[PDB]
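Quick question: what would this complex look like in 3D?
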Amino acid sequence: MRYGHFDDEAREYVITTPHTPYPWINYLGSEQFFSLLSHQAGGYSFYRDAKMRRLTRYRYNNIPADAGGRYLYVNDGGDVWTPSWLPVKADLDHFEARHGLGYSTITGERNGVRVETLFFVPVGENAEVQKVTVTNTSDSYKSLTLFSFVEFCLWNAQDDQTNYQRNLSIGEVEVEQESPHGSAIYHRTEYRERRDHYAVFAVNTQAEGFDTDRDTFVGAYNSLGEAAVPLKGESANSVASGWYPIGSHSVAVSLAPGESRELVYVLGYVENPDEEKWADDAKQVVNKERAHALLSRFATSEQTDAAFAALKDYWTDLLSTYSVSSNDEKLDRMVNIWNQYQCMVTFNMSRSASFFETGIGRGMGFRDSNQDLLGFVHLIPERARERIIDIASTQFADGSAYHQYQPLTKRGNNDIGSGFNDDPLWLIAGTAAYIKETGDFSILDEPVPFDNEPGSEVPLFEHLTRSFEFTVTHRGPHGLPLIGRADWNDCLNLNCFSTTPGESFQTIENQAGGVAESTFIAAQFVLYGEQYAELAARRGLADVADRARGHVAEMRDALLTDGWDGSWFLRAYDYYGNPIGTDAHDEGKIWIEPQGFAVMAGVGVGEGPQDTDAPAIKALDSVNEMLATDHGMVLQYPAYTTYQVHMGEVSTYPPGYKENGGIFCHANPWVIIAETVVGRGGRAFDYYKRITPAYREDISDVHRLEPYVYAQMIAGKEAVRHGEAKNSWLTGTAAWNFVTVSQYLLGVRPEYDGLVVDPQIGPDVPSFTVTRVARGATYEITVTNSGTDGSRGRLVVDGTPVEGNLVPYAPAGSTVRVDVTL
Amino acid sequence: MRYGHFDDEAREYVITTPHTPYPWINYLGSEQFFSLLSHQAGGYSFYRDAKMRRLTRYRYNNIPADAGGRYLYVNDGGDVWTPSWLPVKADLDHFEARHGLGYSTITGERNGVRVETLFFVPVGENAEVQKVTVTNTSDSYKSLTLFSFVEFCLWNAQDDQTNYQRNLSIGEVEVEQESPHGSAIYHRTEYRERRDHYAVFAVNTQAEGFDTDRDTFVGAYNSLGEAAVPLKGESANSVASGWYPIGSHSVAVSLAPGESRELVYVLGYVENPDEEKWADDAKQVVNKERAHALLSRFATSEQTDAAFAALKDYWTDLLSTYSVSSNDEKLDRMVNIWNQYQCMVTFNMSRSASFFETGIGRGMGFRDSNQDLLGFVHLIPERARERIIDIASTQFADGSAYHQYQPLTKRGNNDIGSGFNDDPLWLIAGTAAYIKETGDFSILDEPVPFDNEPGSEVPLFEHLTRSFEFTVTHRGPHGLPLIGRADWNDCLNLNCFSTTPGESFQTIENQAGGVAESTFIAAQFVLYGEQYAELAARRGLADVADRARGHVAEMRDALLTDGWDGSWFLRAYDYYGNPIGTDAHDEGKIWIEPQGFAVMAGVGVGEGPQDTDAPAIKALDSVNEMLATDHGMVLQYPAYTTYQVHMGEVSTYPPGYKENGGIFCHANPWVIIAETVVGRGGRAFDYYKRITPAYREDISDVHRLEPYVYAQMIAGKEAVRHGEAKNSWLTGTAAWNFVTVSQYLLGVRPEYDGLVVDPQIGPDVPSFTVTRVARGATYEITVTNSGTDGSRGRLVVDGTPVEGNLVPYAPAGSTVRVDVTL
Ligand SMILES: OC[C@H]1O[C@@H](O[C@H]2[C@H](O)[C@@H](O)[C@H](O)O[C@@H]2CO)[C@H](O)[C@@H](O)[C@@H]1O
Ligand SMILES: OC[C@H]1O[C@@H](O[C@H]2[C@H](O)[C@@H](O)[C@H](O)O[C@@H]2CO)[C@H](O)[C@@H](O)[C@@H]1O
C-alpha cells in the first residue's frame, strides 16, 4: 500500500487520498503557539501549553476516528460538501493533502468547484493562519455560499473535556461582524475570571452571516457531517450563553469559470495586559486593540502569501547547518528534511501532545527533553541554551530531579511518576552537547535555581555535579546504581509489587527499601561520568575531575563483573538481589537496553569487530540472534506470558506490545552506534533503514501511520499486528535517530576541540557530501566509502593530509575541505 | 411543548419521540452495579464505582450529543435501522420509551418490523439484563439478521478516556461462541494485570456470528449510525489485540406475520477470587465458572420475565413506608413515586455520575450524602446505617472532615477541594435522623474509625462530638463560625483571591489567615447544635448536653446581632471583617441561604405569620421581593457583572447562572419549611410547585430536561436561557424536596418520642390520606385542610382526642388512625 510520496525538491510529503489508514498530521508553529492538523484538517490548536490553553476542541476516541477539525462548509445550490472530505465524507472529483515544514495544504474538488486551503501558523504570530483559494473550474457559473467551522475548547482540557457541571454555564462569547478588516468573533470564556486573554476567529470579508453555538449551528439529532446551518443555505447567526460555542462567518462567492476569490482566516491567541483588559469601566467588553492588529497584518492574500515565504525561508535557512548529497534519497530526505524536522516538533512538544497524547496528563519531561536537546542543539543553539536552564531548574538540590515539568508554568510535576533514578544524568547528556555544538562554557556559569525556588541559584555546574553525584551516592551492593521507580523506561519497577487495579504504575506507591539495581543506568553513567569529569576538568577542577573520573571505573568495572552474562548484560538486579534478564529465565533473558547503551559508552569493547572475544561483540551478536526483527529490535526477548509481580508495569502488556517485546524504536538507535562504535557499519545501517520511515513509504498499510516520522512503538514479532506502529510523532527516536546519522553513521560529529569526521555506513552508501556549519565555518565533507568492517577514514583537510578523527575548529566565514577515504 | 406523560398506575414516565430536547435517562440498579440508560439506549454501565470500573464507554461532549449507547442493528433485506433511532437515526413508523423504577423500555418500529427492548439491572445480579422482543407486524414474511452492539470501557475512565499511549495496546478480549447457554464474549483487558475480574456480554442463542473490535465492526471513515458490519449482512467476526473492543453476536430471526422470537442479553461485571482466576497453569485463559452461571440464570424469557417482577415488587414493596392519596396527582406522583425514586439514585450516586457528571472527578461527598441520607433513611434504614458509618469514617480525629470519599475504595478524597468548614455538622444532620426513623441509638455505639485508620475507632458519638466542637473551636470575632474554603456551596471562597487561570477554585490554594465567617454555617449549627446536645442528653451526658446546648445560643444570639440586616441575614463577614450580602452593595445584597436555613433552624421567629416584626418574616418577605422567580428562588440577588476577587468562584459565572443568580433548587426547599416553620403554608407550596417537575410536564421545552427529576440549576431570571435547567438527576434537591413534603408540607414527620403530624399545605390541597409505616405500625392520616395562615391541625388519634403535634409510637403490626383538622 501507498497513499502519497515525498517531494524533496518542495520539501514536503504529498497525499493522494483521505482514505489513509490512520490520520496523518503535521505540526504547525515552532515558537509559542503550535497547531496540530490532520491532513483532514482535523486536529486542534494551543498556546505554549495544550493542557491548559487548548484554543480549540478535539475529541480522541471518536467514531469515526477524527471527525472534527477546521472545516469549510460549501453549499452549491443546495449542495453541501467539504474538501476535508471529513466530516460530510462526500464524493470527491479530486483530492490531495501535502504536509509541509510548518504547514500543510488541503485541496478538495467536487461538482465543478475547487477549494484549496493553506494551513500555517506563521512566525511571530501566535495564530494559525489559513489562506483559502476557492476557484471555479467549470464552463458554467457556480454561485456558492461558504461556511467556516471551528469548535473552541474552553481553554482547559482537563476541565473542559471532563468537567461539565461548572463548564456548560461559562461559555460567553462576543461577536463583531463589522470588524475593521472583515468580520470576526472572540471566544472569551472565563475572561471575566482571572484570564486576561482569549482567542480571535476571523475572515477578511464582511461576513454576511455567522454563528457561535454548536447545537444552534448543527441542531440536535445531528452529526458534524450533517451540520444543519450549512444545508439551510444561510446562518442562524446564533449567539452563545453557555454550552459549546463555535465560530463561523457566512460568506458567498460568485466566480466566472476559472474565476476565483481569496479568503483569509485568522485564529489567534489574542491577549492583553490587565490594565488595558477592558473597553469599559463596566468591564463588560473585551479590549480588542491587540486583536484588531492581529487580523490586520493578515487581511490580504499579499500578506498571507507574504508570510508563507517568511517561514519557508525560516525552515529554508534552518536546514543548512546540516545537510547531505548521496545516492540514497531514502537516506537524504530523512536526515536533510523530514527527520531534522521531526526532531523539531519534539523540542517543542516534549511528549505533551500527539494524536496518541491527550496532551493533558503530559507536560514536558526532564528525561524526554534532555535527550530531545541532542537532536536540536544544532538547529538553534540560542533557543536550546534556555531549555537546558529551563529543564535544569526542575532540579532538586537533592540532585534528585523532577520527572517532568508543566510546560506553561515552567514548573515541576509530580503528576506522573516520581523517583526515576536515571533522570539526573540526562542533564549532563544533552547539556555537555550544547557546548560541543557551540563551545559555550558560558552556560555552566549561568546560575540555575533549584525547584524554581529563588535565592538558591547556583552556576549550572552544580546541576551537573549534583546529578553526577546523585548516582555515586545511590547505588547497590554490586556498586551498581539504583533503579528506584525505574531506570529509563518506566515499565521496569522492581519495588512496586501490586495486585490492586486502578492505580497507574507510575503514580502507584513505591515501596521503601531495596538492594535493587539497574544496569542500564550504570551504563549511561559510564558515558556521562566522563561527560562531566572532563567539562569539570576544563574547569581546572583537576582534583575533582579524577574523583569523578574514578567513580566511572569502579562503575565501568562493576558493569562487567556484575552485569555480565558472558553473552549479554544483565537487565537488573531486582529487589532482594536476584537478577533479571539472565539466560536463566524462560522469558526475558535478553533486554536490549544495557546492550545498546553499554556499547555506546564503550564497555566491553575490543580491538576490532573481527575479534569476537569482546563482550561488545557477544552482546550485539545476541540481540542480533534474539531481539532483532526485520522491522526493528524488540525491547527484549522473549516477551511475557504472565505478570511479573516484582517487575511492575512491564508484563501488563500482552506479548509483542510496547515495553513488552515490542519494538521500542527509541531503544534501537542506541545500539546502532554500538555497531558503528564496534565497526559493524554494515549492520547498524541495516538496522537504521530497518526501523526507518524514509524506507517506510513501502507498506504504508503495515504501519497505518505517517511514513515521514519516527513513531515510538512499531508492533512486535510476538504480536498479531506486528509492524503496527502507534504513537508516531513524539518519540525520542526522532532526536536519537537524527543523532546517529548526524554523528555516527555519516560520522560528522563535533567535540570541544574540533570537528570529528568518522563515517561507518556499511557499503550500501559509497559516497556523500556532507556540509555542516560549525562555528561559522562551512565544512564540505566529500567521502569515499568502500565498507571494510572496522574500516576507517583518513582525513585530507584542505589538500594537506592530517592525523586524527579530528579537524581543527575554523575561523568563521571560512570554508573548509575535508576528504576522507575508508 | 411535551414529549410524554406520567402513567402513575404503571409507575412510569412515557415518551412519544426520540426528538426530546436533551437526552432523558433512567438509573438502573440500586445495590452494587448500576447502569445509566438514555431513552435512546445511550449511556453506560459500572460496578460500584464508575470512575474506576466503567464497564462500558460513553462519550460526553458528543456530536450529536449522545450517539453511542447499547444498540441493536437490524437488517431487513439490506435494510439497517435501529429503534434507538440513534445512531442510524432512521425513519420510524412508531416509537416510544418508558422510564421505570429500575428499568426502561425502548420500542421502535420501521418497515413492518417491531423491536422492543426491556432494559433492566435486576437485584442480586451485578449485571444489566436486556430482554428483546422482536415481533413482526406484517402480512408478508420478514427475514432478519440482528446485530447487537456495545463498546466496552477499559475499566477505567480517567485512564481510558484520557490516556491512549499505554491504553491502545492492552485491549485483549476472549470469545466463546459455543457457550453453554448461547454464545458470548469476555472483556478482560488488564486482567493479566492486577485485575481479578472482567465483564461478560452474551445472548442466549447460538450466535451465528460476532465481533470484538470496533473499527473492524464499523470500518474507518465511518460513524456509529454508519456501522459497516450491520450493512454487510453478516459479521466480520473480528477478534481484538489492542485498540477499542466491542461485543456483538450475529443473530437471525424468521417470523410468520405476528410471529415473534425472544432474545436475552447478559452484560455482567463477572469476577473471581484470585486462586480460581485461571483455567490454566499457563494463566492464559479466564476462569468462567462465575460467568457461566451468570448467563445461566438469565437464559430464558421465563427467567428474564421472572426477574422483571422480582424488582417490580422490590420497588413495589418499597414505596409503602410513605405514600399519599389526594386531588393533586401532580403532588402525588412526585412524593409517592418519582421523587422518592429520584431520592434513591442519589443515595447511591452521591454526585458521582450523571450525564453532566463525567463521573471521574467525583466520588461520593461527605456533605452531599449526609444530606442525601435524610431523603433515604425511610426507604431502607439498614442500608442507611452503614453509610452513616461509611461516611462518618472519612472523619478526621481533628473533627475536620474529608470533603468526600472514593466510593469504591471507600476512602477519603482530597481530589476536589478541602477545608470545607460546614461538612463536620452534616454528620449530625443525616445521622440524628437515622434514629428518628428507627430509634436505633445503637449506631452511636457502633465504633467508627478516623480516616479509615485502624486502632482509632471510637463510638460514632465522638464523630458527633468532634464535629459539633469543630465549629465551637473554629469561629470568628463575631462568635460566628468560620467559612474556610467555603460554607455549604463552594462558590463562596473568601480566602482565595486569584487572578491566574488553570486552577479550579476548589483545588486552588487557600490562603492562611482570616477573620472570615459564614452566617449560613452559624445557621446550620443552631439546628444541629441541638440535634446533638439532645442525643447526647438522652445519653445521660446531661452536664455536656448543656454546654453544647449553650454554645448554640451564644451562636443563636450572635446570628441576629451580627448577621442581621434588619431585613435579611448577612451572607458573610469576609476576609478582613467586612460584610457580604448587605443592602450596602450594588450587587448581591440578599443571599438566599442564611435566609432559608436560619428559619428552618428557627432563628428570629415570632408569634405567628401575621406578626411582621419577626426577622423570620422580614427575612422571607424579602427573598419574596428580591430572589423569588416564577421558576424558583435564585441563589441571591442581584447576580454579578464583575469578578469579586475576594469571594472566589462565585462571580466567574455570568449573571443568571448557577451559584451566581441562578436558581439553585437545592437552596429552595430549605426556605419552604421556613414558610411552613413560619406558617405561610400557602407561600411555601407555591414555591414547591414552583421549582417542581411534577408540574414540569408543562413546558418540557423550557427545561430541555427530564420532567420527573429534581435537577440542580434551573437558569436564572438574569440569564437568557432562564428556565433552562441543567444537571438534572443528581441534586440534593431530590433528597431535600422529598423531605419537605415528607415532613413539613404533608407534615408527617418523626421524632425520637413519637410521630408528629403537622401539615401546612396552603389551601391548594384541602384533603389527603397519608399512610406511613413507622416502627412496624401503619399510620393512616386522613386530613382536613382549610388553609388559615398560621392554622394548625388538632389530632384525634383512634377516635379519642389528644394534645400535641405528637402521636405515641405504636406497637408493631398495629394500625392507627390519625385525624387532624386545620
Ligand atoms: O519507557 C520508554 C519511555 O517511555 C516513557 O514512558 C511511557 C512509555 O512510553 C509507555 O510505553 C508506558 O506505557 O507509559 C509510560 C508513561 O510514562 C517515558 O517518557 C520515558 O522515560 C521512557 O524511557
Ligand atoms: O454549591 C452548592 C453545591 O454545589 C456543589 O459544588 C459544586 C457546584 O454544584 C457547582 O455549581 C460548582 O460550580 O462546582 C462545585 C464543584 O464542587 C457541592 O457538591 C455542594 O457542596 C454545594 O453545596
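Answer marked as accepted. Chain A has four domains: 1-271+700-710, 272-321, 322-328+746-822, 329-680+711-745.
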